Amino acid sequence: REIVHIQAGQCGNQIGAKFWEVISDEHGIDPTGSYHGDSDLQLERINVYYNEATGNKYVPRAILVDLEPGTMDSVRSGPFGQIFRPDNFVFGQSGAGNNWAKGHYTEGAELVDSVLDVVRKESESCDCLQGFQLTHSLGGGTGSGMGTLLISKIREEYPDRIMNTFSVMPSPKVSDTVVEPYNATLSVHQLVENTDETYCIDNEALYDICFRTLKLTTPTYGDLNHLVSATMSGVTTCLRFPGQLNADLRKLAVNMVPFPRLHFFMPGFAPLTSQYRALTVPELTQQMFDSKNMMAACDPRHGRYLTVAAIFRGRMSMKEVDEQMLNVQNKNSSYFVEWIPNNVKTAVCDIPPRGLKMSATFIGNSTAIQELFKRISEQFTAMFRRKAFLHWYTGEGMDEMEFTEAESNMNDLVSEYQQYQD
């Protein structure tokens, strides 16, 4: 079961670049593509994210997309830049100017066809393609605009494959432009309709974790992206490493998504790292469900968990893992829906992440995620009610009504997340 990776935009390629830099190490793949590990478990499922080449070389099944050549030149010049397939670099020149319209309708349109040719070529060499995973931000123009355009076009051609995304939400605390709510609202509507699984990565959460928890006075995008790498490694562990659960993207969606539109997951990770003391199983569980370890900036206690999937990594007592997991459910039983039995799933992997002996990653379909969409919606209306900055989008051919629709679709999503909270 192969997965095709796609990274779009500055944020999409920079977090995506780190993702490959991380798992490549976890599987023992050097920057040249040669395997230099010890455990065969590293290679039992290497085909999921890597294609084997001549001379036992492992090339990521990744596609790098951007309307500017800047962020992709850095990737090629980065640590693991020589490992990516050269043909899979697809870039434009004019850029998207942090404009959703430019990425979705005008400048991305010129480039989108070329990308699908690479996607098609990768899918053709997949014995059993299970789906695609995209990394991008919703606040910019390329990853947001063009990224959703690709998702829409990929669905038209692979309607029976799972569409997964790691979607970085904008935040005024970490902001590049005031039109980020416009771009994010337009993108959210697309994700609601055309994805099965969206990992909501809120830059507000990443910032607070770097500032409050990790005690970094001035977080940099690199600091926030270290958090994203740890999470992306955690939520792909069951895919990348063998287990008794034969995990795949379709199974995750069937069990995590009770309603097709409510597929926006709150990811959490423990222990938060920027360090020699090992962490016990109860410590992982407590921190994992703690709001200070959530990557979405929502209070879980303000909502209810529809479904939860937790992954513990390292050598530990699986019996103890149960003892502490069931404890949380039985303690905070009010924060889990009572009408979905056995809505908490736990898996264990003996292989720990690089640098830690014990770790735990958490995937939560919580109705508290409505707080995030409400935050975006408020920021969106605050500008739209005065049509502020709309000329950047109407100049690219869009009409006001398309905003009013995305606004309504956003407010509707919040209402849907609310009805299931009672």
């Binding site: 829409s152 669905r155 038209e156 309607p159």
Partner: protein
Amino acid sequence: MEVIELNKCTSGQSFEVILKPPSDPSLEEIQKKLEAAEERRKYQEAELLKHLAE
């Protein structure tokens, strides 16, 4: 408490102990519902492409 039908063999024996007396569809019908499900599955798909065409 009456043992009855004491059958015995080399590999075993069996008996009964009374303690108190007393006081499908056809192949076509299958294919009909099966093919009918793929029709709804292909119609729901066609609607998706029609929606994406818009």
